[PDB]
Structure 1
Amino acid sequence: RSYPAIPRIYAETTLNMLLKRAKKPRVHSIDEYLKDGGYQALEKALNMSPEEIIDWVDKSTLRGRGGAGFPTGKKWKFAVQNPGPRYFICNADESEPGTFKDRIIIERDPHLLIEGIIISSYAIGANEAYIYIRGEYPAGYYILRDAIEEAKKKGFLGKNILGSGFDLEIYVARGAGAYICGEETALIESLEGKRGHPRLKPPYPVQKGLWGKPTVVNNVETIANVPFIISMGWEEYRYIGPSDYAGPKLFPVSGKVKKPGVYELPMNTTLREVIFKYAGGTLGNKKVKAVFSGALDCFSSEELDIPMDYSPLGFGGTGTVIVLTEEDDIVEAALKIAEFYEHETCGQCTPCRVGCYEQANLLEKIYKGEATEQDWEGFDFVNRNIQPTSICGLGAVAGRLIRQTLEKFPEEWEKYRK
């Protein structure tokens, strides 16, 4: 019936796939999903072997939409070479700054995600699947629980789904405020009822995950592609966008654009096109100064002609586009990124624990003009020394974006030293 208030994020698509329904800012329940041919891909999937499904997902060129772009079919293959039981996890922790692509699938077209989960679970022989949704998405949580009951009603979940002999339950767990619980191993620890502390990898979850068993973790958006791959076939899916980085991709665009929101576009779209062709250009038609790819990278105005794909020279990441214009202070922006990492390090690793803290502590001093000479040289050193001994990607990147601003905007930083 009634869900918590959600802002009506603008959404636009040139492909009409992931956002076919989710372009409209409301919950689409199972009847509307079914009228659009929903769950027919699941029926088709259940008449295929798991191996064919893995083969199709592999040949689709689908890559992880959670940010790292690992080939999805290949991840599945690694899982299924290990003895079961196996588990499937949908990562809905989406907490990266600027990143709001996953919630609009969850909150508007939950059956797209659920269908994807059922197909993926069948493909890897998992009879128990989880959605881990961040605690700050309460509406998403209630919407998913309700959608799962709808799917049960209609016989898409439970035992012996559609006479296939395949059994599945999907459990919805909630986070409780930790960005680090989106890291796949910390997510598993949390599902096990513990603190969200990343594990040393390898092993990867596919070898040793939930309860030590083969576990696939996939991002919401990744999973939402799976119904299309089955429905269209892998070849037709590969026609979408460039054949090496095929398929729809969601781009959350925020900051100083005229039309902030989520754009469903192919990955041969350029960053300049995302900003100027789709997102309406800049507020006040000011010049673009920088784009933050979440809290991961900083691209300058000289780097706008790159493709939004997972190539070496491409944008990569989550597809998150935070636009800063000419009057935005880059050091102020850097401080916010430092504050983010300070707040989210889990503190297992010493350089990450003290580095994330000191980077933020000293950058605050610099920003307020209270920094000594040593504070300056200290900030530089700490920024370069968060990564050593780190066992997860947070420590690996906590200094990355800030370093890129030091390199690409030296003049602004110098104003703060002199």
Structure 2
Amino acid sequence: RSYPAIPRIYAETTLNMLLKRAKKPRVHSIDEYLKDGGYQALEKALNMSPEEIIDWVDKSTLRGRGGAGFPTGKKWKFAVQNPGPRYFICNADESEPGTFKDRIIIERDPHLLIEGIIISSYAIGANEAYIYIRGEYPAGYYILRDAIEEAKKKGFLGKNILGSGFDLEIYVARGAGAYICGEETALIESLEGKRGHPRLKPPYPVQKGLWGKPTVVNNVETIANVPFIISMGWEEYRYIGPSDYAGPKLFPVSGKVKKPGVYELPMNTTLREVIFKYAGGTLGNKKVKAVFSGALDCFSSEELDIPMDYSPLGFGGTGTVIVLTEEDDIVEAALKIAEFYEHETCGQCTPCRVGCYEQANLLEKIYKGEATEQDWEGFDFVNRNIQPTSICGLGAVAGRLIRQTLEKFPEEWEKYRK
């Protein structure tokens, strides 16, 4: 059928795995997927025990592609130590600034995700799975609904899948404008028909999630890896990139680069190589001033030689690379980040609620040169005090990137103080 218009995001791969089809900016339906050996991994998995599938995913070193980098096999193991029923959730809320890696899987190769969801659901003994896709991805929603019907038609979903005795239905829920609904416990609250208010953790969803039952939440890109682990085996999967941070990774690159788009690269790729080797360097060959890792971290021009892996000295996060060049005002950019957090705090926690608002309100006065001495000292104080009592990662990091700009670009901030 006809889907809503989607910008044709550039996609390029050195590995030809996650982007084997998704490098072409169009829907790949089940026949094209089946032509490339699609759903043969699912058939292989259904002839293995759930325990064996968990072991392979564990041994693969697969880590959470949603941005926290939690070991995927280890998450699954925690779930299956708890009595059922269990639920599997695909987090497709993708709302971090500069982060458009998941949407090109959903919109272009939806069967890669669906095959991933079926194998993972089988592995953890979940007979009911959910995709929660953000409201502002309507095309992704219709593409997934149609893809799931294709899968049903071919007997990859429903009861007794391929004579295995494994039953699965995948339900597609839509968000309605909240960044916070991507936080796994807020997502679960939204799936239950409520406001997206994060839950105090522990318990983690794997212990108490959807209707209080053991629940695995995994990112789109994480799940998309599962068919490759089963198809190749974990040993071969681990040959891709460095053996400690193995597998393909999607790097969404935007801002002041010549070739903005998504790059499928191994995680031993450096930040400098992503910008200059793959994304074609900077617009007008201007010097890199900073890289925003979404709204999470700010890297200076002195930090471009870091691996794009989940190591302590690594880039980590979503792999999101927003490039600022020498003429981009860091305080203006900091203001845009403050405005984001102001708009998205759910308000449950007092220092998050007032701090996200005050950080944005004071930084705007600073940017416009209307800040009193009190507002300056106020801004510094609130930036340092959004985190206390926070029950989710939003409050924990709402000041992080802006603090990093204060420490890495003090001369620019001082201009705004005088």
State TM-score, norm by structure 1: 1.00
Question: What is the deviation of 1:235?
Answer: 0.1
Over residues 216-269 of structure 1, what are the superposed CA-to-partner deviations in whole Å (9 max), with x where a residue is unaligned?
A: 000000000000000000000000000000000000000000000000000000
Question: What is the deviation of 1:417?
Answer: 0.2
Question: What is the deviation of 1:287?
Answer: 0.1
Other structure's SS at 1:66 match: coil
Q: For 2:157 and 2:171, how far apart are their aligned partners in 1? A: 11
Q: For 1:380 and 1:224, how far apart are their aligned partners in 2? A: 41
Question: What is the deviation of 1:91?
Answer: 0.1
Corresponding residue pairs, total? 418
Partner of 1:326: 326
Over residues 22-57 of structure 1, what are the superposed CA-to-partner deviations in whole Å (9 max), with x where a residue is unaligned?
A: 000000000000000000000000000000000000
Q: For 1:171 and 1:415, how far apart are their aligned partners in 2? A: 53
Question: What is the deviation of 1:306?
Answer: 0.2
Question: What is the deviation of 1:83?
Answer: 0.1
Question: What is the deviation of 1:357?
Answer: 0.1
Other structure's SS at 1:253 match: strand
Question: What is the deviation of 1:85?
Answer: 0.0
Question: What is the deviation of 1:103?
Answer: 0.1
Question: What is the deviation of 1:151?
Answer: 0.1
Q: For 1:324 and 1:235, how far apart are their aligned partners in 2? A: 39
Question: What is the deviation of 1:394?
Answer: 0.0
Other structure's SS at 1:403 match: helix
Q: For 2:322 and 2:401, how far apart are their aligned partners in 1? A: 13
Other structure's SS at 2:44 match: helix
Partner of 1:113: 113
Question: What is the deviation of 1:393?
Answer: 0.1
Question: What is the deviation of 1:399?
Answer: 0.1
Q: For 1:121 and 1:238, how far apart are their aligned partners in 2? A: 23
Instruction: Give the % identical residues.
Output: 100
Other structure's SS at 1:88 match: strand
Other structure's SS at 2:157 match: coil
Q: For 1:145 and 1:156, how far apart are their aligned partners in 2? A: 14
Question: What is the deviation of 1:345?
Answer: 0.1
Q: For 2:257 and 2:199, how far apart are their aligned partners in 1? A: 39
Partner of 1:145: 145
Over residues 111-149 of structure 1, what are the superposed CA-to-partner deviations in whole Å (9 max), with x where a residue is unaligned?
A: 000000000000000000000000000000000000000
Question: What is the deviation of 1:110?
Answer: 0.0
Q: For 1:254 and 1:127, how far apart are their aligned partners in 2? A: 39
Q: For 2:6 and 2:64, how far apart are their aligned partners in 1? A: 26
Partner of 1:187: 187
Q: For 2:134 and 2:372, how far apart are their aligned partners in 1? A: 40
Over residues 268-322 of structure 1, what are the superposed CA-to-partner deviations in whole Å (9 max), with x where a residue is unaligned?
A: 0000000000000000000000000000000000000000000000000000000
Question: What is the deviation of 1:351?
Answer: 0.1
User: Deviating runs (4+, > 2 A) in structure 1?
Assistant: none
Question: What is the deviation of 1:408?
Answer: 0.1
Partner of 1:159: 159
Over residues 188-226 of structure 1, what are the superposed CA-to-partner deviations in whole Å (9 max), with x where a residue is unaligned?
A: 000000000000000000000000000000000000000
Over residues 91-114 of structure 1, what are the superposed CA-to-partner deviations in whole Å (9 max), with x where a residue is unaligned?
A: 000000000000000000000000
Question: What is the deviation of 1:89?
Answer: 0.0
Partner of 1:233: 233
Question: What is the deviation of 1:81?
Answer: 0.1
Partner of 1:275: 275
Q: For 1:184 and 1:154, how far apart are their aligned partners in 2? A: 31
Question: What is the deviation of 1:352?
Answer: 0.1
Question: What is the deviation of 1:69?
Answer: 0.2
Partner of 1:95: 95
Over residues 325-350 of structure 1, what are the superposed CA-to-partner deviations in whole Å (9 max), with x where a residue is unaligned?
A: 00000000000000000000000000
**Unaligned segments of structure 1, at least 5 residues:** none
Q: For 1:173 and 1:42, how far apart are their aligned partners in 2? A: 24
Q: For 2:86 and 2:360, how far apart are their aligned partners in 1? A: 41
Over residues 67-101 of structure 1, what are the superposed CA-to-partner deviations in whole Å (9 max), with x where a residue is unaligned?
A: 00000000000000000000000000000000000
Q: For 2:38 and 2:282, how far apart are their aligned partners in 1? A: 38
Q: For 1:208 and 1:259, how far apart are their aligned partners in 2? A: 43
Q: For 1:382 and 1:64, how far apart are their aligned partners in 2? A: 31
Partner of 1:85: 85
Question: What is the deviation of 1:391?
Answer: 0.1
